[PDB]
Amino acid sequence: GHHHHHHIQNFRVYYRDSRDPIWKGPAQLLWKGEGAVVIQDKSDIKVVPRRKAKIIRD
Amino acid sequence: GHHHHHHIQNFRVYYRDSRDPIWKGPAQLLWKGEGAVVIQDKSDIKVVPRRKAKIIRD
Amino acid sequence: GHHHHHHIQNFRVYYRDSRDPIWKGPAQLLWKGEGAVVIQDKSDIKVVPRRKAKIIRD
Ligand code: NI
Ligand code: NI
């Protein structure tokens, strides 16, 4: 059914996908753990290695 | 696309949201991390720190 | 809102649904935690204990 993944308030994330060196974002933070991060960028929810993500506390 | 996050069977979760002292729930458990849990309450999927969550075995 | 959970590239997962002994899949891998994995099988996103999942790097 329809649902919404509420982001972790007061955080924004810049990230890189796979091997592309371009920074993407800012994006929302959904989860962090196991040396990885879950981000939501518009309608796309992606898993990114922690060192491929810059987390910023607004 | 359209999808459903199936809850972890035989568990319910009461949780505290943001700055409201009243407990919400019972909600579904989607994921149990070491420091936080992912819950689903109706169409809302939220990340709650373990200290603000009460996992019930039913 | 509408969104898509992008899978972790180059992984295929076979799994069992709790009691049912029949193997299901191939499914996409969304998250590999400690003790469990999150998989997507068409419209269903499920949490599977690690012992009940076979992750294949292809
Ligand atoms: Ni729709
Ligand atoms: Ni979803």
PDB file of C-alpha atoms and ligand atoms in Angstrom:
ATOM      1  CA  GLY A   1       0.000   0.000   0.000  1.00  0.00           C
ATOM      2  CA  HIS A   2       0.935   3.715  -0.161  1.00  0.00           C
ATOM      3  CA  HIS A   3       3.397   4.735   2.570  1.00  0.00           C
ATOM      4  CA  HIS A   4       5.953   7.437   3.317  1.00  0.00           C
ATOM      5  CA  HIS A   5       9.467   6.902   4.673  1.00  0.00           C
ATOM      6  CA  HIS A   6       9.926   9.752   7.144  1.00  0.00           C
ATOM      7  CA  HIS A   7      13.489  11.054   7.074  1.00  0.00           C
ATOM      8  CA  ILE A   8      15.767  11.665  10.057  1.00  0.00           C
ATOM      9  CA  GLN A   9      15.049  15.299  10.909  1.00  0.00           C
ATOM     10  CA  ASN A  10      17.848  17.885  10.955  1.00  0.00           C
ATOM     11  CA  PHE A  11      20.122  15.934   8.587  1.00  0.00           C
ATOM     12  CA  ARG A  12      20.978  16.261   4.881  1.00  0.00           C
ATOM     13  CA  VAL A  13      23.278  13.966   2.875  1.00  0.00           C
ATOM     14  CA  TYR A  14      25.549  14.382  -0.129  1.00  0.00           C
ATOM     15  CA  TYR A  15      26.482  11.086  -1.755  1.00  0.00           C
ATOM     16  CA  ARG A  16      28.023   9.367  -4.770  1.00  0.00           C
ATOM     17  CA  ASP A  17      26.552   6.469  -6.756  1.00  0.00           C
ATOM     18  CA  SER A  18      28.567   3.351  -7.626  1.00  0.00           C
ATOM     19  CA  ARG A  19      31.734   4.514  -9.440  1.00  0.00           C
ATOM     20  CA  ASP A  20      30.511   7.960 -10.596  1.00  0.00           C
ATOM     21  CA  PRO A  21      32.782  10.602  -8.987  1.00  0.00           C
ATOM     22  CA  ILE A  22      30.106  13.323  -9.141  1.00  0.00           C
ATOM     23  CA  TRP A  23      28.635  14.370  -5.803  1.00  0.00           C
ATOM     24  CA  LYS A  24      24.838  14.159  -5.658  1.00  0.00           C
ATOM     25  CA  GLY A  25      22.332  15.756  -3.318  1.00  0.00           C
ATOM     26  CA  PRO A  26      21.485  17.230  -0.969  1.00  0.00           C
ATOM     27  CA  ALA A  27      19.338  14.242   0.013  1.00  0.00           C
ATOM     28  CA  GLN A  28      17.411  13.028   3.040  1.00  0.00           C
ATOM     29  CA  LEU A  29      18.763  10.509   5.535  1.00  0.00           C
ATOM     30  CA  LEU A  30      16.566   7.461   6.149  1.00  0.00           C
ATOM     31  CA  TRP A  31      18.925   5.077   7.972  1.00  0.00           C
ATOM     32  CA  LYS A  32      22.553   4.576   8.948  1.00  0.00           C
ATOM     33  CA  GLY A  33      24.332   1.401   9.956  1.00  0.00           C
ATOM     34  CA  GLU A  34      26.666  -1.422   8.951  1.00  0.00           C
ATOM     35  CA  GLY A  35      29.038   1.041   7.316  1.00  0.00           C
ATOM     36  CA  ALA A  36      26.307   2.156   4.914  1.00  0.00           C
ATOM     37  CA  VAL A  37      23.613   4.818   4.627  1.00  0.00           C
ATOM     38  CA  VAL A  38      20.084   4.809   3.202  1.00  0.00           C
ATOM     39  CA  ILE A  39      19.212   8.086   1.471  1.00  0.00           C
ATOM     40  CA  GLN A  40      16.076   9.363  -0.248  1.00  0.00           C
ATOM     41  CA  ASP A  41      16.647  11.656  -3.247  1.00  0.00           C
ATOM     42  CA  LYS A  42      13.205  12.675  -4.575  1.00  0.00           C
ATOM     43  CA  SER A  43      11.495   9.347  -5.442  1.00  0.00           C
ATOM     44  CA  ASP A  44      14.752   7.339  -5.313  1.00  0.00           C
ATOM     45  CA  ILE A  45      15.813   5.509  -2.141  1.00  0.00           C
ATOM     46  CA  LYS A  46      19.413   4.316  -2.388  1.00  0.00           C
ATOM     47  CA  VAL A  47      21.961   2.479  -0.246  1.00  0.00           C
ATOM     48  CA  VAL A  48      25.377   4.168  -0.200  1.00  0.00           C
ATOM     49  CA  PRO A  49      28.644   3.158   1.525  1.00  0.00           C
ATOM     50  CA  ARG A  50      29.340   5.448   4.463  1.00  0.00           C
ATOM     51  CA  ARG A  51      32.562   6.820   2.970  1.00  0.00           C
ATOM     52  CA  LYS A  52      30.595   7.714  -0.188  1.00  0.00           C
ATOM     53  CA  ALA A  53      28.316   9.996   1.850  1.00  0.00           C
ATOM     54  CA  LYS A  54      28.721  13.326   3.623  1.00  0.00           C
ATOM     55  CA  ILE A  55      26.155  13.743   6.410  1.00  0.00           C
ATOM     56  CA  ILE A  56      25.413  17.322   7.487  1.00  0.00           C
ATOM     57  CA  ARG A  57      23.563  18.373  10.659  1.00  0.00           C
ATOM     58  CA  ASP A  58      21.392  21.387   9.768  1.00  0.00           C
TER      59      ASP A  58
ATOM     60  CA  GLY B   1       6.773   1.234  -8.040  1.00  0.00           C
ATOM     61  CA  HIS B   2       4.015  -0.016  -5.749  1.00  0.00           C
ATOM     62  CA  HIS B   3       5.333  -2.240  -2.961  1.00  0.00           C
ATOM     63  CA  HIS B   4       4.564  -3.371   0.576  1.00  0.00           C
ATOM     64  CA  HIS B   5       6.971  -3.588   3.512  1.00  0.00           C
ATOM     65  CA  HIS B   6       5.986  -6.800   5.289  1.00  0.00           C
ATOM     66  CA  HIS B   7       6.246  -6.468   9.060  1.00  0.00           C
ATOM     67  CA  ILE B   8       8.236  -8.808  11.288  1.00  0.00           C
ATOM     68  CA  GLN B   9       5.716 -11.406  12.435  1.00  0.00           C
ATOM     69  CA  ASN B  10       4.658 -11.812  16.070  1.00  0.00           C
ATOM     70  CA  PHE B  11       5.874  -8.383  17.204  1.00  0.00           C
ATOM     71  CA  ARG B  12       4.236  -5.035  17.934  1.00  0.00           C
ATOM     72  CA  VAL B  13       5.884  -1.757  18.909  1.00  0.00           C
ATOM     73  CA  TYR B  14       4.807   1.214  21.004  1.00  0.00           C
ATOM     74  CA  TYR B  15       6.935   4.289  20.384  1.00  0.00           C
ATOM     75  CA  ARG B  16       7.407   7.941  21.299  1.00  0.00           C
ATOM     76  CA  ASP B  17       7.406  10.420  18.424  1.00  0.00           C
ATOM     77  CA  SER B  18       9.626  13.509  18.510  1.00  0.00           C
ATOM     78  CA  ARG B  19       8.772  15.649  21.555  1.00  0.00           C
ATOM     79  CA  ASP B  20       5.369  14.184  22.512  1.00  0.00           C
ATOM     80  CA  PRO B  21       5.509  12.295  25.844  1.00  0.00           C
ATOM     81  CA  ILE B  22       2.510  10.055  25.058  1.00  0.00           C
ATOM     82  CA  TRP B  23       3.262   6.599  23.674  1.00  0.00           C
ATOM     83  CA  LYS B  24       1.953   5.768  20.205  1.00  0.00           C
ATOM     84  CA  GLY B  25       0.999   2.359  18.865  1.00  0.00           C
ATOM     85  CA  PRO B  26       0.663  -0.498  18.668  1.00  0.00           C
ATOM     86  CA  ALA B  27       2.680  -0.267  15.448  1.00  0.00           C
ATOM     87  CA  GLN B  28       4.409  -2.801  13.216  1.00  0.00           C
ATOM     88  CA  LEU B  29       8.112  -3.638  13.437  1.00  0.00           C
ATOM     89  CA  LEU B  30       9.962  -3.480  10.113  1.00  0.00           C
ATOM     90  CA  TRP B  31      13.587  -3.569  11.305  1.00  0.00           C
ATOM     91  CA  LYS B  32      15.455  -3.877  14.604  1.00  0.00           C
ATOM     92  CA  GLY B  33      18.875  -2.239  14.549  1.00  0.00           C
ATOM     93  CA  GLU B  34      21.311  -2.028  17.426  1.00  0.00           C
ATOM     94  CA  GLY B  35      20.577   1.640  18.127  1.00  0.00           C
ATOM     95  CA  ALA B  36      17.221   2.227  16.450  1.00  0.00           C
ATOM     96  CA  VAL B  37      14.124   0.506  15.105  1.00  0.00           C
ATOM     97  CA  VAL B  38      12.037   1.047  11.981  1.00  0.00           C
ATOM     98  CA  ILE B  39       8.295   0.957  12.651  1.00  0.00           C
ATOM     99  CA  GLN B  40       5.207   1.334  10.488  1.00  0.00           C
ATOM    100  CA  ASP B  41       2.097   3.056  11.860  1.00  0.00           C
ATOM    101  CA  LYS B  42      -0.661   3.026   9.216  1.00  0.00           C
ATOM    102  CA  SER B  43       0.989   4.618   6.140  1.00  0.00           C
ATOM    103  CA  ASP B  44       3.887   6.140   8.132  1.00  0.00           C
ATOM    104  CA  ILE B  45       7.279   4.415   8.327  1.00  0.00           C
ATOM    105  CA  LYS B  46       9.458   5.980  11.026  1.00  0.00           C
ATOM    106  CA  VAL B  47      12.887   5.486  12.583  1.00  0.00           C
ATOM    107  CA  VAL B  48      12.767   5.499  16.397  1.00  0.00           C
ATOM    108  CA  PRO B  49      15.761   5.185  18.771  1.00  0.00           C
ATOM    109  CA  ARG B  50      15.652   2.066  20.921  1.00  0.00           C
ATOM    110  CA  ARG B  51      15.194   4.137  24.084  1.00  0.00           C
ATOM    111  CA  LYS B  52      11.947   5.558  22.637  1.00  0.00           C
ATOM    112  CA  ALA B  53      10.575   2.167  21.541  1.00  0.00           C
ATOM    113  CA  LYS B  54       8.943  -0.726  23.397  1.00  0.00           C
ATOM    114  CA  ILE B  55       8.957  -3.987  21.431  1.00  0.00           C
ATOM    115  CA  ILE B  56       6.205  -6.415  22.456  1.00  0.00           C
ATOM    116  CA  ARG B  57       6.194 -10.147  21.698  1.00  0.00           C
ATOM    117  CA  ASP B  58       2.743 -11.325  20.609  1.00  0.00           C
TER     118      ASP B  58
ATOM    119  CA  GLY C   1       4.522   9.127  -1.634  1.00  0.00           C
ATOM    120  CA  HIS C   2       5.564   7.097  -4.668  1.00  0.00           C
ATOM    121  CA  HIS C   3       9.167   5.893  -4.480  1.00  0.00           C
ATOM    122  CA  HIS C   4      11.475   3.073  -5.527  1.00  0.00           C
ATOM    123  CA  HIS C   5      13.967   1.181  -3.356  1.00  0.00           C
ATOM    124  CA  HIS C   6      17.039   0.733  -5.554  1.00  0.00           C
ATOM    125  CA  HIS C   7      18.636  -2.663  -5.073  1.00  0.00           C
ATOM    126  CA  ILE C   8      22.282  -3.402  -4.338  1.00  0.00           C
ATOM    127  CA  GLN C   9      23.867  -4.131  -7.709  1.00  0.00           C
ATOM    128  CA  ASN C  10      25.275  -7.531  -8.702  1.00  0.00           C
ATOM    129  CA  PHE C  11      23.387  -9.512  -6.032  1.00  0.00           C
ATOM    130  CA  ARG C  12      20.624 -12.151  -6.303  1.00  0.00           C
ATOM    131  CA  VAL C  13      18.929 -13.670  -3.225  1.00  0.00           C
ATOM    132  CA  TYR C  14      17.024 -16.873  -2.653  1.00  0.00           C
ATOM    133  CA  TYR C  15      15.053 -17.155   0.567  1.00  0.00           C
ATOM    134  CA  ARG C  16      12.378 -18.991   2.528  1.00  0.00           C
ATOM    135  CA  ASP C  17       9.280 -17.517   4.188  1.00  0.00           C
ATOM    136  CA  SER C  18       9.529 -18.656   7.806  1.00  0.00           C
ATOM    137  CA  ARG C  19       7.930 -22.114   8.057  1.00  0.00           C
ATOM    138  CA  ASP C  20       7.447 -22.778   4.296  1.00  0.00           C
ATOM    139  CA  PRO C  21      10.346 -25.026   3.175  1.00  0.00           C
ATOM    140  CA  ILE C  22      10.031 -24.012  -0.496  1.00  0.00           C
ATOM    141  CA  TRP C  23      12.824 -21.769  -1.778  1.00  0.00           C
ATOM    142  CA  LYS C  24      11.729 -18.492  -3.356  1.00  0.00           C
ATOM    143  CA  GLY C  25      13.447 -16.014  -5.643  1.00  0.00           C
ATOM    144  CA  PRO C  26      15.487 -14.797  -7.277  1.00  0.00           C
ATOM    145  CA  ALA C  27      14.993 -11.599  -5.283  1.00  0.00           C
ATOM    146  CA  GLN C  28      16.819  -8.285  -5.100  1.00  0.00           C
ATOM    147  CA  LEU C  29      18.968  -7.394  -2.090  1.00  0.00           C
ATOM    148  CA  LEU C  30      18.110  -4.088  -0.407  1.00  0.00           C
ATOM    149  CA  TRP C  31      20.022  -4.305   2.893  1.00  0.00           C
ATOM    150  CA  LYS C  32      22.418  -6.803   4.486  1.00  0.00           C
ATOM    151  CA  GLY C  33      22.473  -6.249   8.235  1.00  0.00           C
ATOM    152  CA  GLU C  34      23.826  -8.424  11.020  1.00  0.00           C
ATOM    153  CA  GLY C  35      21.560 -11.449  11.354  1.00  0.00           C
ATOM    154  CA  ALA C  36      19.041 -10.567   8.642  1.00  0.00           C
ATOM    155  CA  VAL C  37      18.674  -9.189   5.131  1.00  0.00           C
ATOM    156  CA  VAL C  38      16.011  -7.093   3.427  1.00  0.00           C
ATOM    157  CA  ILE C  39      14.935  -8.408   0.022  1.00  0.00           C
ATOM    158  CA  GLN C  40      12.472  -7.299  -2.639  1.00  0.00           C
ATOM    159  CA  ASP C  41      10.535  -9.958  -4.577  1.00  0.00           C
ATOM    160  CA  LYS C  42       8.404  -8.052  -7.120  1.00  0.00           C
ATOM    161  CA  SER C  43       5.989  -5.974  -4.976  1.00  0.00           C
ATOM    162  CA  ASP C  44       6.980  -7.518  -1.617  1.00  0.00           C
ATOM    163  CA  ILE C  45       9.811  -6.250   0.589  1.00  0.00           C
ATOM    164  CA  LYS C  46      10.594  -8.733   3.348  1.00  0.00           C
ATOM    165  CA  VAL C  47      13.037  -9.210   6.209  1.00  0.00           C
ATOM    166  CA  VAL C  48      14.715 -12.631   6.141  1.00  0.00           C
ATOM    167  CA  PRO C  49      17.078 -14.059   8.780  1.00  0.00           C
ATOM    168  CA  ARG C  50      20.529 -14.685   7.352  1.00  0.00           C
ATOM    169  CA  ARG C  51      20.215 -18.449   7.880  1.00  0.00           C
ATOM    170  CA  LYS C  52      17.153 -18.478   5.590  1.00  0.00           C
ATOM    171  CA  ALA C  53      18.790 -16.581   2.709  1.00  0.00           C
ATOM    172  CA  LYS C  54      21.331 -17.467   0.020  1.00  0.00           C
ATOM    173  CA  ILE C  55      23.084 -14.385  -1.381  1.00  0.00           C
ATOM    174  CA  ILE C  56      24.700 -14.885  -4.795  1.00  0.00           C
ATOM    175  CA  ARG C  57      27.095 -12.314  -6.257  1.00  0.00           C
ATOM    176  CA  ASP C  58      26.423 -12.292 -10.004  1.00  0.00           C
TER     177      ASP C  58
HETATM  178 NI    NI D   1      -0.200   4.836  -6.408  1.00  0.00          NI
HETATM  179 NI    NI D   2       8.849   1.917   0.550  1.00  0.00          NI
END
